[PDB]
């Protein structure tokens, strides 16, 4: 009895916990997608490997197991490099399976012959071309384990066409057991005590909850830590939901004031990178003290020195903090000038955005549109929010009540992930509603994938906030001097719903928002809501821009 | 106010980060770097080839837990140093290669020694960076140092253009980070600690393997207490020798092939299941062997063979967890089992086989007769640089180590060319110790010129060459039309190289010369070279399996 | 029928492709490759370090127009050989590095010397490939050879796993390509030939520069006929020396800085406007200089300075076009111009400055006094391996070359470590010639062990060391607490290294020793080593500009 290399890899992937595969078929990976379906792996055929590679990385973040992207040789694999880099930037587990020309045709100028290993090298923790068919399960298990052990990351498997279509005896093939979950590593006890001792000396302490705690499934231990200590906390863009965004101790409406004045910050799975302004002045105080919790030891002390390094798993380390807090109880006083200054800043920004929510001007503004979107999103729904102002204002206006329920451009600030991450969320959570909120430019990067979501019957609603271009476009286009960031004025993107027989809606006035969004979200097929806004609407004014 | 050059900034930053030694060769454009380093108190060693200097930097990283620094000129100087980057990459040792580069405003012009040096170092480094400006040089130095010692230790590369080295900025606009502290010693979950000890109590033929990862973690005291308390048989890796003294009664080194082939549960303390351990696979292991793996690299867990209990973290801290759990729940392996009896029987058989080889006075001499006098005259706390094939492999079993991190060999990469460089690195780290360099005649040739480097800097090194006329032996006379590829000049008098620097060189052929020559040579104020001729038929003890599993 | 191993296939394919020499060091897994190569008639040279062996392979490529082959073991052996790949990359010389690799079925296991060797060689090679199967080995060998010599010549790398080397296939399923013929000598458009000659007739101060690209193209006869017919002044690049005999009356080598600074039109015959020619930019050139560029690489045209007439193609064929067009439309530069007068005046001034330096009998001696006796005793057709800084730069101007491709120096990459390797390469290519190796004391240390390699293979090489106690000089006594970074042991007796292989070593300090020592040394049946001490204050002739433009 024989078995093909495609049937070996599909059986090895399924045994290693792979349940979702995204990509596009063709020479030579056609039998791999067929064998994947026979093993129970759900395969999603995309319209471009770029979006499919982004969807695989989102699965790794949502599940702790690598999403798999399948691509053909040459240009197909290169399109999927975008997913490798995005998973590399966010430390997400992901595997790109790229076909390759037959091994005995190397050097001949074979069909789509390309240096695919060296192309994937800068963004992968692991890259391998399996030497033989019988050893395929070795490479599948080693790639899966490398993506999820240590600091999570991406891997690339280079499959020549003759390894895929060739056959061996089943008795030759050894299959490793399913890769167990890695051990949740602890921090030394003297560091746990030093972290709590430093918190007792702080006058203006602050907790920052990043998506590292979300990936670590640490939402329970993190909330118990914040509530026991009574510390004010700031959630990162994709860290919101780990603690419900309606929590009384959130200081999200005073973000700039909190970062600028805190004297001790606890980074719970969050990097002091561009998203946190490198922890440097003027966005921070020059003498801010840092307690850093991260599984990557190399990340400790980046840009600003770390006083207490907590290297290890976020859930296990936070469990250490809560256990020591039970032995020596401590909590931050609820009546301090730090709290008074924080709440005073929260009330000032609350009154600033209050009239924006109730502004019925036409063309509409961001806050008026997102208010009706916010009030219709189910509490357990997954939010795919992409764009510039559409994503930034949606970050503050759209709350998350559970961890790992927001997917945005993330660390790499990538446009082109919206529809793919929405499809990834739908595959992981088939019992939930997926709300995709994109800017008009962000929608164009992968707009064809709305047919992909409809083809597989995914419960996704596509909302487009349109201001006629990248950060806005004019109402009329001078055909001689077209602004480089502008698109066709009032482009009817909702008409793309007619491609697959869905319902598209065009919205310009505030009275349409609530009935259109409610009706579109109840459609059996994915609906597209195209909402026009003024090219002059913007976020709440700030002392500092987000790009330091 | 006052200004400062990039070279002086780099030297000051390196000194703040704990760098005391710098090995390399000067030239355009890194001359002021070595000058400023000596001005700061950093001892610079001028080698004869950057290849040997880069190997020395990686050995300093293993011996100290702090990155050894190699300084190389642009182009071919940095490329010569990639060998050391790759060797530190293979052994997970901390080191920094500081390579000069052509002036940035001359890129694309065909500048002097213009080369893609970042991309050349990329496959073997955890961190490669060209500092963008002179003022941010301390940022890159601290980031490189921290990346080499945090997490799984490894190599890094700093690409310094000439204008960044020779240019100047005001001192007021330069910020120096604090000295990078040692990384936290990571613990394993207490459930895994109990699971590892509970698995040991189910094993009928358990085995402990002590690797050089436990040596790098400075975990010798915890590793010894663990093996003594449990009473378990233990095997030392080639550079794991010394963590527990090699004369320990629980060592089964003389029954290595038997222990690996019959153990049912092995505890890997800082050692990989790579080519050295035959991938943990049959026929060298049992196909159902259970593994307790202790490693700082989570990605290493489960390689080749599955791991039953994973102990991810620092060896010293995790071994302290095992010892603490043993004091709470005592247990020890019995001293009277059939496992001990089979191990002791195999030890006595291999001891009887090699016993007459130690006393064979035949000329040309054999490995065991020569290594016997080296073993018995070496200071008990000396540091051994052992390199070659049979010279290193037989020297591994014959020459014992009683302290951790006192043996330096070809290591995981099996590299020829590290012998003299690692001996120089050991001397620079331990100036109060005697360094013994035991190389085969071929391995000595890879970096033989560096004997003058050791003499120039007054290092307490004694060079011993075990010469069989080539790579694994060569004939006594050479056919000019049929010279074997691995042969050298018969009776090559390498000891005459001691006359280059005014040292003494010895030529040994008969056993009556061994003891008086080695005694006088080791007492010389200059590095002596003892060229000992051996038979080209001499080889190691016969084994059922070769060391290279394939 | 009969079977054949991959090693025997590689050796047979290399022999068919014209490979006669193979330099390197054997070991796992490339032992049968060197054995099969010797079985085929390929002469194998066992070096002491692959670094020097890889430099030797590139020198063979320059001397023959056919790729020199370097054989290296897996891991660190191949990484040592990257230095030669980079040197061939910098000089556009054909060479192949054949590096072994671990067994393919052991990838990912931590196999012996497992390393990303393709990616390590990538930045410096035109072609890197791991043969997919044993039967297709001749395909990869011919493709590698052809890629090294077709187009702009360069380096290539072949990654051979151990199982591909030791495995066997039937001979019937192996196809061997024909011997790769020499590439066609490409012509320039006849409109560009006329445009180049018409531009020459408008120049008031024209200059011809002969580079080693014209030497590689075997274009010496056409280049000499071109310069003689036109009567133009010509300057020879460092390794362009010998294309036209250096005693030619039209050479303006003694007025180099004046010629470059005042020429209004230059003809580049196989020479780049890189760091050697100071990028063709002021202050070393006039900002309005016109350029006629002759190069096989179209991408090189117009680098740094614009090219008025582009002559893309083979130097020999294009120079033959210029000579053919000159016979059809005769022209020559007049022998009586102010340009000639200024050049001749500058030559006589520099000759008068260095004339007493040649005759200075002061002790410690100077460069010019020592190089005078080397120049006057060298055989007129000898091949010179000159390496170092001042030793190489002054030796470039003092030691003349009368035949093309008879000087081998640090070349474009300015590499230290090529001296002995290139001397061995020259001897292997020209066994009927005397090879003279003139190195500084520092450059000798980079590959000093290879003197035994030259002696073991009976090569007619004489090693001369110009010793000033370090890199650019060192003190007479060393302060143990303040050793300069570029200093070595004072009065280091490197000549004692000749006693390693039974040769004769000489120590020279006074001028009365120069002539009798050099005469006796060059007549020795074994490679002699002449260690000549010079003053640490001796330097080259004073110049207005330094050689390093920055
Ligand atoms: C880098 C950042 C984390 C920086 O955060 P900020 O935008 O500066 O703060 P935000 O949390 O988003 O909130 C913005 C402001 O709204 C205030 N805010 C927040 N919540 C509220 C509520 N509930 N009510 C009123 N006001 C609020 C908050 O205090 C800030 O004002 P102040 O406190 O007064 O400042 C983020 O901007 C980000 O991730 N941007 C993504 C960049 C990107 O990838 N773009 C796409 C590619 S573009 C090429
Ligand atoms: C890969 C290895 C770990 C494999 O270990 P082995 O050599 O097989 O075992 P070793 O521990 O070295 O010991 C060899 C044999 O001697 C026995 N032995 C050990 N100690 C003693 C004593 N004290 N007395 C008697 N016999 C002894 C031991 O039981 C073995 O026999 P048996 O039990 O009967 O087998 C090692 O060989 C190694 O690291 N080699 C390095 C290779 C290298 O890098 N070469 C340079 C590049 S070459 C291209
Ligand atoms: C870059 C260079 C081409 C630059 O050429 P220069 O040295 O400036 O000129 P050279 O031709 O070598 O000659 C030097 C001077 O001697 C004069 N000269 C030349 N020949 C003669 C004779 N026969 N008689 C008298 N004077 C002479 C010549 O006019 C120059 O003076 P003036 O006309 O008055 O200037 C060369 O220096 C070079 O290739 N250097 C290699 C550097 C290197 O790789 N070093 C090793 C690594 S170091 C890290
Ligand atoms: N299981 C885990 N436990 C702890 N930290 C983790 C874990 N997984 C990833 N991390 C770390 O969390 C950090 C996330 O940083 P970042 O993505 O910048 O957060 P955010 O963007 O939400 O601020 C990464 O540095 C990563 O090393
Ligand atoms: N501080 C540390 N604590 C625990 N393990 C470590 C530490 N530093 C390195 N290691 C691990 O030790 C292992 C050493 O394995 P190896 O070099 O194969 O040892 P040997 O060659 O002696 O068998 C590496 O895999 C490395 O991840
Ligand atoms: N057969 C050939 N015909 C013409 N030009 C060639 C040939 N082979 C190589 N070249 C060119 O000659 C040039 C040599 O330049 P370079 O090495 O800088 O010479 P030098 O160092 O002597 O100035 C290279 O740019 C190369 O492209
Ligand atoms: C791959 C990629 N290409 C380009 C960009 C730059 N970029 C950031 S936001 C954006 C589009 C902004 O327009 P839109 O999404 O419609 O948002 P809004 O106008 O509401 O801000 C672009 C092109 C990017 N981040 N990623
Ligand atoms: C950089 C490098 N080049 C080549 C080799 C191959 N190699 C392994 S051992 C050895 C030399 C063996 O001879 P010697 O050191 O004299 O020891 P002996 O076995 O003869 O005692 C060589 C060249 C290597 N391991 N590393
Ligand atoms: C591979 C490499 N390492 C280092 C250098 C830097 N370098 C240039 S010349 C030189 C040695 C100069 O001394 P020596 O050869 O003795 O000549 P001298 O100038 O003293 O006559 C060195 C180390 C280099 N060019 N290449
Ligand atoms: Ca927009
Ligand atoms: Ca030997
Ligand atoms: Ca010198």
Author numbering:
A (entry chain B): 2 to 549
B (entry chain A), C (entry chain A): 1 to 550
Reported in the publication:
One such enzyme is 2-hydroxyacyl-CoA lyase/synthase (HACL/S), which catalyzes the reversible cleavage of 2-hydroxyacyl-CoA (2hcCoA) into formyl-CoA (fCoA) and an aldehyde or ketone. Originally identified in the mammalian α-oxidation pathway of 3-methyl-branched fatty acids, HACL/S has demonstrated remarkable catalytic reversibility, as it is capable of condensing fCoA with various substrates covering a wide range of aldehydes and ketones with different carbon chain lengths.
TbHACL/S was co-crystallized in the presence of fCoA and hCoA. On the other hand, the asymmetric units of CoA compound-TbHACL/S complex contain only two slightly different monomers (protein chains A and B), each protomer from two separate catalytic pairs (AA’ and BB’, a prime indicates symmetry related partner), which means each catalytic dimer is formed by the structurally identical monomers. Several residues engage in close contacts with acyl-CoA (R545, K546, Q548, and W552 in ApbHACL/S and R540, K541, Q543 and W547 in TbHACL/S) through electrostatic, hydrogen bonds and van der Waals interactions. The C-terminal covering regions are coming from the second protomer. ApbHACL/S has stronger activity on C2 (acetaldehyde) compared to C1 (formaldehyde) and C3 (propionaldehyde) substrates, while TbHACL/S discriminates less harshly between substrate chain length. Structures of both TbHACL/S and ApbHACL/S with and without acyl-CoA indicate that there is no notable difference in main chains and side chains except for the well-ordered C-terminal regions.
